[PDB]
Design a protein around this motif. Structure first.
Motif, PDB file in Angstrom:
ATOM      1  N   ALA A   8     -12.742  11.093  -0.542  1.00  0.00           N
ATOM      2  CA  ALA A   8     -11.951  10.000  -1.080  1.00  0.00           C
ATOM      3  C   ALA A   8     -11.401   9.156   0.058  1.00  0.00           C
ATOM      4  N   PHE A   9     -11.223   7.866  -0.214  1.00  0.00           N
ATOM      5  CA  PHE A   9     -10.721   6.918   0.765  1.00  0.00           C
ATOM      6  C   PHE A   9      -9.518   6.184   0.196  1.00  0.00           C
ATOM      7  N   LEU A  10      -8.432   6.149   0.964  1.00  0.00           N
ATOM      8  CA  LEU A  10      -7.234   5.403   0.590  1.00  0.00           C
ATOM      9  C   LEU A  10      -7.470   3.939   0.940  1.00  0.00           C
ATOM     10  N   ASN A  11      -7.679   3.116  -0.080  1.00  0.00           N
ATOM     11  CA  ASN A  11      -8.017   1.717   0.104  1.00  0.00           C
ATOM     12  C   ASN A  11      -6.889   0.827  -0.414  1.00  0.00           C
ATOM     13  N   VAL A  12      -7.055  -0.478  -0.228  1.00  0.00           N
ATOM     14  CA  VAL A  12      -6.107  -1.476  -0.707  1.00  0.00           C
ATOM     15  C   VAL A  12      -6.859  -2.465  -1.585  1.00  0.00           C
ATOM     16  N   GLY A  13      -6.360  -2.679  -2.799  1.00  0.00           N
ATOM     17  CA  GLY A  13      -6.951  -3.655  -3.692  1.00  0.00           C
ATOM     18  C   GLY A  13      -6.404  -5.042  -3.437  1.00  0.00           C
ATOM     19  N   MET A  14      -7.254  -5.947  -2.966  1.00  0.00           N
ATOM     20  CA  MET A  14      -6.801  -7.257  -2.525  1.00  0.00           C
ATOM     21  C   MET A  14      -8.002  -8.187  -2.448  1.00  0.00           C
ATOM     22  N   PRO A  15      -7.785  -9.502  -2.553  1.00  0.00           N
ATOM     23  CA  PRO A  15      -8.910 -10.447  -2.508  1.00  0.00           C
ATOM     24  C   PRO A  15      -9.354 -10.773  -1.093  1.00  0.00           C
ATOM     25  N   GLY A  16     -10.056  -9.847  -0.447  1.00  0.00           N
ATOM     26  CA  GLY A  16     -10.472 -10.043   0.919  1.00  0.00           C
ATOM     27  C   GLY A  16      -9.319  -9.839   1.877  1.00  0.00           C
TER      28      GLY A  16
ATOM     29  N   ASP B 290      -0.320 -16.290  -2.699  1.00  0.00           N
ATOM     30  CA  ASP B 290       0.255 -15.274  -3.571  1.00  0.00           C
ATOM     31  C   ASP B 290      -0.838 -14.278  -3.931  1.00  0.00           C
ATOM     32  N   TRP B 291      -0.694 -13.045  -3.459  1.00  0.00           N
ATOM     33  CA  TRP B 291      -1.744 -12.045  -3.573  1.00  0.00           C
ATOM     34  C   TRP B 291      -1.256 -10.845  -4.374  1.00  0.00           C
ATOM     35  N   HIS B 292      -2.132 -10.337  -5.227  1.00  0.00           N
ATOM     36  CA  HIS B 292      -1.859  -9.157  -6.039  1.00  0.00           C
ATOM     37  C   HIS B 292      -2.395  -7.950  -5.277  1.00  0.00           C
ATOM     38  N   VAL B 293      -1.494  -7.195  -4.663  1.00  0.00           N
ATOM     39  CA  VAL B 293      -1.869  -6.097  -3.781  1.00  0.00           C
ATOM     40  C   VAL B 293      -1.800  -4.788  -4.552  1.00  0.00           C
ATOM     41  N   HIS B 294      -2.932  -4.098  -4.635  1.00  0.00           N
ATOM     42  CA  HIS B 294      -3.026  -2.805  -5.293  1.00  0.00           C
ATOM     43  C   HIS B 294      -3.230  -1.716  -4.251  1.00  0.00           C
ATOM     44  N   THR B 295      -2.655  -0.549  -4.513  1.00  0.00           N
ATOM     45  CA  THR B 295      -2.994   0.661  -3.774  1.00  0.00           C
ATOM     46  C   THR B 295      -4.038   1.387  -4.613  1.00  0.00           C
ATOM     47  N   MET B 296      -5.171   1.693  -4.002  1.00  0.00           N
ATOM     48  CA  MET B 296      -6.268   2.277  -4.747  1.00  0.00           C
ATOM     49  C   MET B 296      -6.866   3.466  -4.006  1.00  0.00           C
ATOM     50  N   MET B 297      -7.525   4.332  -4.769  1.00  0.00           N
ATOM     51  CA  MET B 297      -8.242   5.470  -4.218  1.00  0.00           C
ATOM     52  C   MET B 297      -9.693   5.382  -4.655  1.00  0.00           C
ATOM     53  N   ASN B 298     -10.592   5.253  -3.689  1.00  0.00           N
ATOM     54  CA  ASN B 298     -12.022   5.246  -3.946  1.00  0.00           C
ATOM     55  C   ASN B 298     -12.537   6.673  -3.814  1.00  0.00           C
ATOM     56  N   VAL B 299     -13.252   7.137  -4.830  1.00  0.00           N
ATOM     57  CA  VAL B 299     -13.809   8.483  -4.854  1.00  0.00           C
ATOM     58  C   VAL B 299     -15.318   8.383  -4.693  1.00  0.00           C
ATOM     59  N   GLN B 300     -15.881   9.278  -3.875  1.00  0.00           N
ATOM     60  CA  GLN B 300     -17.282   9.185  -3.470  1.00  0.00           C
ATOM     61  C   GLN B 300     -18.232   9.027  -4.649  1.00  0.00           C
TER      62      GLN B 300
ATOM     63  N   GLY C  51      -0.449  -2.871  -9.140  1.00  0.00           N
ATOM     64  CA  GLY C  51      -0.540  -4.008  -8.235  1.00  0.00           C
ATOM     65  C   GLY C  51       0.730  -4.833  -8.273  1.00  0.00           C
ATOM     66  N   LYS C  52       1.129  -5.336  -7.110  1.00  0.00           N
ATOM     67  CA  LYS C  52       2.349  -6.112  -6.966  1.00  0.00           C
ATOM     68  C   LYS C  52       2.040  -7.447  -6.302  1.00  0.00           C
ATOM     69  N   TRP C  53       2.624  -8.516  -6.837  1.00  0.00           N
ATOM     70  CA  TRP C  53       2.461  -9.833  -6.239  1.00  0.00           C
ATOM     71  C   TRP C  53       3.280  -9.930  -4.960  1.00  0.00           C
ATOM     72  N   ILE C  54       2.606 -10.226  -3.853  1.00  0.00           N
ATOM     73  CA  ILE C  54       3.246 -10.388  -2.555  1.00  0.00           C
ATOM     74  C   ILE C  54       2.915 -11.779  -2.034  1.00  0.00           C
ATOM     75  N   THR C  55       3.946 -12.548  -1.711  1.00  0.00           N
ATOM     76  CA  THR C  55       3.791 -13.914  -1.234  1.00  0.00           C
ATOM     77  C   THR C  55       3.676 -13.916   0.284  1.00  0.00           C
ATOM     78  N   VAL C  56       2.697 -14.654   0.799  1.00  0.00           N
ATOM     79  CA  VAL C  56       2.503 -14.835   2.230  1.00  0.00           C
ATOM     80  C   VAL C  56       2.685 -16.312   2.545  1.00  0.00           C
ATOM     81  N   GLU C  57       3.524 -16.610   3.531  1.00  0.00           N
ATOM     82  CA  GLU C  57       3.764 -17.976   3.961  1.00  0.00           C
ATOM     83  C   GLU C  57       3.468 -18.103   5.448  1.00  0.00           C
ATOM     84  N   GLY C  58       3.066 -19.310   5.852  1.00  0.00           N
ATOM     85  CA  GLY C  58       2.689 -19.587   7.219  1.00  0.00           C
ATOM     86  C   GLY C  58       1.308 -20.214   7.293  1.00  0.00           C
ATOM     87  N   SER C  59       0.666 -20.044   8.443  1.00  0.00           N
ATOM     88  CA  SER C  59      -0.677 -20.553   8.665  1.00  0.00           C
ATOM     89  C   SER C  59      -1.571 -19.429   9.163  1.00  0.00           C
TER      90      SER C  59
END
Ligand SMILES: CCCCCCCCCCCC(=O)OC[C@H](COP(=O)(O)OCC[N+](C)(C)C)OC(=O)CCCCCCCCCCC
Ligand SMILES: CCCCCCCCCCCC(=O)OC[C@H](COP(=O)(O)OCC[N+](C)(C)C)OC(=O)CCCCCCCCCCC
Ligand SMILES: CCCCCCCCCCCC(=O)OC[C@H](COP(=O)(O)OCC[N+](C)(C)C)OC(=O)CCCCCCCCCCC
Ligand SMILES: CCCCCCCCCC(=O)OC[C@H](COP(=O)(O)OCC[N+](C)(C)C)OC(=O)CCCCCCCCC
Ligand SMILES: CCCCCCCCCC(=O)OC[C@H](COP(=O)(O)OCC[N+](C)(C)C)OC(=O)CCCCCCCCC
Ligand SMILES: CCCCCC(=O)OC[C@H](COP(=O)(O)OCC[N+](C)(C)C)OC(=O)CCCCC
Ligand SMILES: CCCCCC(=O)OC[C@H](COP(=O)(O)OCC[N+](C)(C)C)OC(=O)CCCCC
Ligand SMILES: CCCCCCCCCC
Ligand SMILES: CCCCCCCCCC
Ligand SMILES: CCCCCCCCCC
Ligand SMILES: [Cu+2]
Ligand SMILES: [Cu+2]
Ligand SMILES: [Cu+2]
Ligand SMILES: [Cu+2]
Ligand SMILES: [Cu+2]
Lengths: 382, 236, 382
Positions: free
Chosen positions: A55-63, A103-113, A122-130
């Motif tokens: 199993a792999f501890l992954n992050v659910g996110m759009p790239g 504004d990104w929906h960040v999930h904590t996910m577990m990938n199983v082989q 999943g939680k909405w986390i706002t990122v600001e800047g460049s």
């Protein structure tokens, strides 16, 4: 964003995420946000999902809108796949560094082989800047600091352009003369033996010798520079340390569980036996990323996602304090719009109508007990 | 006259339409296109799928029917100059087919890998899929069928029989579209990992091989070009 | 003789052999030498090696210079493959009988069904005498004593020679006449129908009938003689009894571990906590068949192989006695020529730079504690 499509019973009985916390809700570029919590591997792991041996501890996110700086299972870093044991509870911690504004929906996910993705809340986390301000520095054991955003990019571009130019030069050398129809006619009508003549053979010999010599010289030069290299580090990591939870003092037996079709509520009858020495009260029912809360007993303060949080979605027929040693049977209803929004009502389409979840029992002093329940889930139509 | 500016249009229409499609998917990939059960997904990608399927069916029917109805009945009384002009037009059709094949089987297929390699696929109709299989594939299928029909109905060399290499080049890449069933079946059931090199993908590869029939097709078109107006010059 | 080529990290984390002993170092023909010891299956078993569900206790040796008279895991004979459990410690005993004179490097090894050979420490054992004096008697349940060196050899030779003679007779019968070119010309030019005529068909019928009849008669005769036969006895044996070791009173936490490239030393920082009620001292570090000893604390008397034994190869920054309850952090250096001779320095080539080993802690009275350590092994270049 990839859940609400997986089977409801498979989301219910794979992995239960709880005690989830997020260090920040809004971050700047290069700022770090930490996600913590616990996950429990359900004992009734579906046979269609391979056991979480790999199993792999992954992050659910759009790239890579965040970069995974660190990830821990237990207290140790897990950059590779890990082995998990069914029935064990593990604590995790993922450190993310903001890279892309939005504004990104960040999930904590577990990938199983052999079972695919198990997506947590999943939680909405706002990122600001460049994005141009993002840096990913790293220091090697050879004593040099590089930025992973652009390190080796110039070398890669140079070598690819060089070899592409060599190939294009070969093709153009042969393409200066007429290409298709006259050559086809020459080959067909009689022996050709005229379109490939010296110094064409000399040019081809030069191309071959130069290619081999350049490959050898480039390899030698790339060995003199960077004299210290290691292969890719891979391999499943064993010996993940699970949490040593105390044995629960609450035993719950599920006597039937039903949900209306159509509807947004789930009803179950529980026989709760209180051991230990404190009056308990049912405060929460977590089934699949959805927390049904009895607001009179417990309130969420960890900033759980609102669309996954039912503040008063848990109604207990008799939620009076349960004296130690006393056994009572109550009707528990978990009702919220989330039950239909996250398609937990679509368990009627599933080939295995069984649910699993976590019940959180709270006493007067505030200390809580986690008990796990699983039973067939029977639809009701009339 | 001979080769006219229809080649410029053939390149430009695909280039412009697919650049706009790429802009559309860049704008609506995230943000109405990540969650397949969100209402905005229905308005931005399911509607796209419906409209593109209807338009592809209509365009294929109209184009193929027009090409077949305007077929040259008196192919015998065709002058060599007109045959050369028709050969150049067929070569323009083949150029359009090659451009569409590129856009379908390389750009949107591999960009697809990225899509899947980055997100958790939520349905059989990901905003991007809609682009590849329901556009990058029907469009090149329509172009290939149109080129084959034009060859058969205007070129005497490609008349009086169905050319086997042309039929393979036209139908094999078409078989990739029904192969999407194997892709879906062997994504949800068989194979749960997003691996582009999984056997659930060999149906795309096998029928991608049939595009190698372009070699026999092109030597056939070379012979058709060199029928009456072969020269002289060439071999003289 | 087959190790020093396997991956260093795989040799470090598969199986740890300790308490190894050899009954004799020099033997005569037909004399018995017994190898005893314990092996521990490492918890962090590499994912590339299949779990030791099917394992065989083998002997590493250059052909049958010894014969394996007996082999035990626990206290029971193991002539077949066995099932081992990860994390368990087993004791083993192999009895060897000398067969071939010479100087032989005898290894105790464990073959795993899906991972290949795990070779333990090897010891030079001298055999003197003549191979002609070797006997391997065995008594059957039918009441006859045979020597396995030559039993059934005459029968095997006789039957093979008989059937070879039959085939050669067939070929020669057809080879008396001209063979290739005239027969080819006869077959090509017109119908042949002349090179196969009676009594050739009669001879072939005789050959076929005689072959079938002789096979049937020989089978019947070999059934009348040896009327009692059993099939080959095979099958993995479950229920291997592991050692019930007491829980260690020493806990060790590895805070980083480094080795110089190039170098012959490995350095690690350990936090040692002494429980129980006796002052302990670090006496040994075993990593992969190599024992680094602190000579001031412990001395080897079991005749361990010298090239695998570092008498003073273990240097502890502060190896003063550790009072019970006391926790201290020390720098431990394991340095010996063996680290480079057995290519333990080549972990820099490995795709998984993690080490595992055993630490042996000794108190004043002499009783010892075994603790297992595993951590990433970080190369250092400057
Ligand atoms: C071989 C035959 C192929 C047939 C299939 C063709 C598919 C065409 C696209 C489907 C769109 C859909 O289905 O969606 C309808 C979309 C949804 O966007 P919206 O929400 O209205 O936002 C506002 C529109 N923007 C986001 C595009 C700004 O709106 C539309 O009306 C616009 C569609 C324009 C398509 C024509 C331009 C193509 C580029 C120019 C060179 C040709
Ligand atoms: C005349 C010849 C035609 C034959 C073709 C018929 C299709 C075969 C259907 C298999 C069903 C079966 O036999 O069993 C089904 C087995 C049961 O496995 P499971 O226990 O559910 O594993 C669980 C693992 N999951 C959760 C991922 C499923 O799933 C399989 O392993 C599917 C094996 C793939 C077979 C299809 C290959 C198609 C080749 C395509 C290349 C062009
Ligand atoms: C003469 C040529 C003979 C061809 C040999 C075929 C046997 C190879 C299959 C091994 C199965 C395996 O072991 O799978 C390897 C990994 C699966 O990774 P995993 O999930 O960790 O596997 C864990 C469970 N296993 C390992 C026991 C299965 O990737 C694959 O699925 C194989 C990808 C094959 C790519 C090469 C084929 C190129 C295609 C060309 C045709 C279009
Ligand atoms: C939005 C869709 C617009 C498609 C327009 C199709 C044009 C009509 C097809 C056609 O018959 O020919 C157009 C051109 C020029 O060839 P024509 O000479 O017009 O074809 C008939 C030959 N004949 C005059 C001797 C009888 O032949 C070509 O090379 C045109 C190539 C167009 C590229 C293919 C576009 C297909 C997109 C799905
Ligand atoms: C979907 C997968 C396709 C399967 C492949 C089978 C076709 C391969 C061989 C082929 O294309 O030949 C059919 C004709 C070529 O002329 P012929 O086959 O000689 O017969 C002409 C008479 N016919 C039009 C009724 C067929 O070509 C045509 O006439 C096609 C133009 C007419 C069809 C237009 C209507 C279609 C609207 C959707
Ligand atoms: C031969 C295939 C060319 C593919 C180029 C492509 O995908 O272009 C999209 C990409 C988009 O990046 P950018 O130019 O920054 O414009 C972004 C607009 N969206 C997000 C809609 C794509 O860049 C361009 O539009 C450059 C134009 C090239 C003309 C051949
Ligand atoms: C031309 C080479 C084809 C080799 C097929 C292959 O690599 O299959 C791997 C797979 C082994 O499955 P695995 O890689 O372990 O899949 C892990 C993910 N799940 C368990 C979800 C499928 O085996 C099968 O299931 C049979 C394939 C039949 C091919 C005609
Ligand atoms: C036939 C060409 C073989 C090239 C071998 C080069 C070896 C270089 C060693 C660094
Ligand atoms: C799990 C083992 C899968 C073996 C697949 C073999 C494929 C061979 C294709 C001819
Ligand atoms: C056609 C020859 C079959 C021979 C059968 C012999 C059976 C013998 C039983 C012991
Ligand atoms: Cu999401
Ligand atoms: Cu659970
Ligand atoms: Cu796919
Ligand atoms: Cu040896
Ligand atoms: Cu061990």
């Amino acid at each position: 964003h990839g859940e609400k499509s997986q089977a409801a019973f498979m989301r219910m009985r794979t992995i239960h995420w709880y005690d989830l916390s997020w260090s920040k809700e809004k971050v700047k570029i290069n700022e770090t946000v930490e996600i913590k919590g616990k996950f429990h591997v359900f004992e009734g792991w579906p046979e269609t999902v391979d056991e979480p041996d790999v199993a792999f501890l992954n992050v659910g996110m759009p790239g890579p809108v965040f970069i995974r700086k660190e990830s821990y299972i237990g207290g140790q870093l897990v950059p590779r796949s890990v082995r998990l044991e069914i029935g064990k509870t593990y604590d995790f911690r993922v450190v993310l560094k903001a890279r892309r504004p939005g504004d990104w929906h960040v999930h904590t996910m577990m990938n199983v082989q052999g079972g695919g993705p198990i997506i947590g809340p999943g939680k909405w986390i706002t990122v600001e800047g460049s994005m141009s301000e993002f840096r990913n520095p790293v220091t090697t054991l050879t004593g040099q600091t590089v930025d992973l955003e652009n390190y080796n990019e110039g070398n890669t571009y140079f070598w690819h352009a060089f070899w592409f130019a060599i190939g294009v030069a070969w093709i153009g050398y042969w393409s200066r003369r007429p290409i298709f129809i006259p050559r086809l006619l020459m080959v067909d009508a009689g022996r050709a033996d005229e379109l490939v003549s010296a110094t064409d053979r000399k040019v081809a010999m030069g191309f071959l010798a130069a290619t081999i010599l350049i490959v050898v010289m480039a390899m030698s030069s790339a060995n003199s520079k960077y004299p210290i290299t290691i292969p890719l580090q891979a391999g499943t990591m064993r010996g993940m340390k699970p949490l040593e939870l105390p044995a629960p003092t609450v035993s719950v037996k599920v006597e039937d569980a039903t949900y209306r079709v159509p509807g947004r509520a789930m009803r179950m009858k529980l026989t709760i036996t209180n051991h230990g020495n404190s009056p308990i009260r049912l405060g929460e029912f977590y089934t699949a990323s959805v927390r049904f809360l009895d607001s009179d007993v417990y309130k969420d303060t960890t900033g759980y996602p609102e669309d996954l949080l039912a503040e008063d979605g848990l109604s207990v027929s008799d939620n009076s304090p349960l004296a130690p040693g006393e056994t009572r049977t109550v009707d528990v209803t978990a009702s919220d719009a989330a039950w239909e929004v996250y398609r937990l009502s679509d368990i009627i389409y599933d080939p295995d109508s069984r649910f699993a979840g976590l019940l959180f029992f709270f006493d007067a002093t505030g200390n809580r007990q986690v008990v796990q329940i699983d039973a067939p889930l029977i639809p009701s139509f009339m | 006259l001979l080769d006219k500016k229809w080649l410029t249009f053939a390149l430009a229409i695909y280039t412009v339409f697919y650049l706009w499609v790429r802009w559309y998917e860049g704008v609506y990939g995230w943000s109405a296109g990540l969650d397949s059960f969100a209402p905005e997904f229905e308005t931005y990608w399911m509607n796209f799928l419906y409209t593109e399927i209807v338009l592809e069916i209509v365009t294929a029917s109209i184009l193929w029917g027009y090409l077949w109805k305007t077929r040259d009945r008196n192919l015998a009384a065709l002058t060599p100059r007109e045959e050369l002009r028709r050969n150049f037009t067929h070569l323009v059709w083949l150029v359009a087919y090659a451009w569409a094949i590129y856009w379908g089987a390389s750009y949107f297929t591999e960009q697809d890998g990225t899509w899947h390699q980055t997100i958790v696929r939520d349905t059989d109709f990901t905003p991007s899929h809609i682009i590849e299989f329901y556009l990058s594939y029907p469009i090149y299928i329509i172009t290939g069928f149109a080129a084959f029909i034009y060859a058969k109905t205007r070129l005497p060399f490609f008349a009086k029989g169905i050319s086997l290499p042309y039929l393979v080049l036209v139908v094999g890449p078409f078989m990739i579209l029904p192969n999407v069933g194997l892709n879906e079946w062997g994504h949800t059931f068989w194979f749960m990992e997003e691996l582009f090199v999984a056997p659930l993908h060999y149906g795309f590869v096998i029928f991608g091989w049939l595009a190698l029939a372009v070699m026999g097709t092109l030597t056939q078109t070379f012979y058709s070009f060199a029928q009456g107006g072969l020269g002289q010059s060439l071999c003289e």
